[PDB]
Amino acid sequence: SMEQVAMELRLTELTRLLRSVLDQLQDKDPARIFAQPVSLKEVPDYLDHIKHPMDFATMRKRLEAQGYKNLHEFEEDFDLIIDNCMKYNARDTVFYRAAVRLRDQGGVVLRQARREVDSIG
Numbered sequence: 001s002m003e004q005v006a007m008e009l010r011l012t013e014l015t016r017l018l019r020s021v022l023d024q025l026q027d028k029d030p031a032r033i034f035a036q037p038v039s040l041k042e043v044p045d046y047l048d049h050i051k052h053p054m055d056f057a058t059m060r061k062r063l064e065a066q067g068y069k070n071l072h073e074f075e076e077d078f079d080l081i082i083d084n085c086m087k088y089n090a091r092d093t094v095f096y097r098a099a100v101r102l103r104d105q106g107g108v109v110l111r112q113a114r115r116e117v118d119s120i121g
Contacts, residue, residue, distance in 0.1 A: 014117065015066050018074050021113045022063060025078060026056050028105040033098045034081050049088050054080035071117045075110060082106075 029035065037055045038046050046053065059077050068074045082103045089095040 010121070011066050011069070013120070014068070014070070015063060017113065017116060017120075018063055018068055018071070021074070021109060022056070022059060024109045025102070025106045028102050028109075029056070029098065031094075031098055033095060034085070034102065046088070050084045052080055052084070054078075054084060056081070071110075071114060078106065078110075 026035070035056050037058060038050075038053055040046055054077050059074075059081075062068060062077070063074075068077075082099045085095055085099040089099075091097075
């Protein structure tokens with residue numbers, strides 16, 4: 001149906017905007033601390049600590065399959081990256097501190113992304 005096509009176009013355009021948001025957030029991680037999944041070979045206990053691991057690569061796989069239906073879903077995965085790190089790592093570590101800085105800088109980006117998603121529809 002044409003109604004289905006139109007919904008699919010809206011999902012495509014959201015995907016485009018979330019791809020630009022993702023790029024901008026990932027630039028706030030110049031150390032690439034969040035770029036890839038935590039390796040279970042290197043951190044064998046990880047899944048005892050963290051129940052829903054997340055990272056930018058995994059988000060980009062979901063995005064390319066158009067698997068984010070709204071901005072809330074995308075934000076949920078970004079918050080997992082930050083919040084996972086802040087639980088597993090202590091305050092005194094480069095990992096924790098990187099997550100704080102990514103959260104703070106990313107908030108700016110997400111505030112305007114929300115206005116764009118609402119504005120464009």
